[PDB]
Amino acid sequence: LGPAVIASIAYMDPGNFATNIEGGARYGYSLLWVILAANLMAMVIQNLSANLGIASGRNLPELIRERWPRPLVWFYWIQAELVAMATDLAEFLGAALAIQLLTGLPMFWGAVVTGVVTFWLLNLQKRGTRPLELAVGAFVLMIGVAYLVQVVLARPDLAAVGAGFVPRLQGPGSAYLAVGIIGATVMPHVIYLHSALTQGRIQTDTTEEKRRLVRLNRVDVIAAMGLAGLINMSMLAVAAATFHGKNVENAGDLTTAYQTLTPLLGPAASVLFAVALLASGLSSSAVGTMAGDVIMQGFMGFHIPLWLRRLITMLPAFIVILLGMDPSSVLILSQVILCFGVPFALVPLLLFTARRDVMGALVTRRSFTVIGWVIAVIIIALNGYLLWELLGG
């Protein structure tokens, strides 16, 4: 399958559902340009991260640990852990919410059931992961194809669709959801993990052999990112055609998101959406847990036991549940926090991929490094404009 698949399941976590449905319901098609821009940003960034592991032989947390001063390494590890908890917050609550959509249990008992499954998910082997990892990939992909079909059948207003690709914002609320979309697509925890997925996969330590893996990875990433982008744009366009302007109660909330596929799936739309949300949440929550321990091992050299890390990341989920906070609102919030961790992940990535002592003959072309720094400035400005609107005028 490759690393572009383990990536792709992270681009369809409950965080993507929350930002797509809410974005289409609240702002129509006006944010389609964000999904396209963020998806093209991820293509460049994930290619740089993948080329870092192939060329250097180490992941990004390892290179920071071995090259940068100890206090800066500590800071970069702390912020990476905050990114890891925010990542798991959306994925754990997304699965717990899907439990409520399927069984009607309260969110607390949905999290208890989610907690037992995730702890049983760590005690897994390749012969046991294969039927479960293939099944969740089937459920999520089929729902994705359902939105590609539904966007055609829903007859979206093409004039509004076309205008939505023109970069425009509509107050602070549109910036909040746009930053959430960027964080949901350009995920910092995948930035650190993608370099670890490609670091050891080499049959002959040769520049010729390394270039092939770079070329083969570039095709697999762009093909995977193109498909994920079409699905995300379809899901936002279908939610826009379904809720935007209709003045429906709790429009954009994940409790009613199944109504986007009701004209296609009929009565099965509720179960098929909740099953997909559950398979998307359980699989991503295990992927992020495996990524967080790899991130800490790379930064600190050591790691806490896997059961303790799984226990710590559950606490913000139960706190949010006990606080009565709306799950769909905190899934979007977590994606916004993730987008604030993107610039930190990009600075070492852009510096390391431009060095010959790190990359060897595979130094990034000067143009793609410039494009990477432009993406870093755009995201810093977007995060700055958002923090500006949230604190003052």
Ligand X SMILES: CCCCCCCC/C=C\CCCCCCCC(=O)OC[C@H](O)CO
Q: What is the footprint of ligand X within residues 306-365 (CB under 6 A)?
A: 325, 329-330, 333, 336-337, 340, 343, 347, 351, 354, 359, 362, 364-365
DSSP state, residue 203: S
Residue 303 to residue 311: CA distance in whole angstroms: 14
253 binds, among Mn ion, ligand X, Cl ion, none (CB under 5 to 8 A by kind): Mn ion
Nearest to Mn ion of 140, 261 (CB atom): 140
Quick one: which segment of 2-10, 15-23, 190-198, 249-257 binds ligand X (CB under 6 A)?
Answer: 2-10
Q: Which of 18, 25, 37, 90 binds ligand X (CB under 6 A)?
A: 37
Q: Rule CB under 5 A: say whether 160 interacts with Cl ion.
A: yes
Q: Rule CB under 6 A: say whether 41 interacts with ligand X.
A: yes
Residue with tokens 């992940």: 345
Size of the site for ligand X (CB under 6 A): 89
Residue 101 to residue 111: CA distance in whole angstroms: 13
Give least dist CB 16 to Cl ion, A. Answer: 23
Give least dist CB 372 to ligand X, A. Answer: 8
Q: Are 52 and 349 in contact (CB under 8 A)?
A: yes
Alpha helices in 301-365 (DSSP H): 306-322, 327-340, 342-352, 356-359
Nearest to ligand X of 158, 171 (CB atom): 158
Q: Rule CB under 6 A: say whether 36 interacts with ligand X.
A: yes
DSSP state, residue 251: T
Give least dist CB 156 to Cl ion, A. Answer: 10
Binding flags for Cl ion, 5-44, as an x/- string (CB under 5 A): -----------------------x----------------
Q: Rule CB under 6 A: say whether 1 interacts with ligand X.
A: yes
Q: Are 341 and 83 in contact (CB under 8 A)?
A: yes
Show the tokens assigned to 277: 């949300």
Give least dist CB 238 to ligand X, A. Answer: 8
DSSP state, residue 364: P
DSSP string spanning 138-194? HHHHHHHHHHHHHHHHT---HHHHHHHTS----SHHHHHHHHHHHHHHS-HHHHHHH
Binding-site ranges for Mn ion (CB under 5 A)? 10-11, 13, 15-16, 184, 253, 255, 326, 328
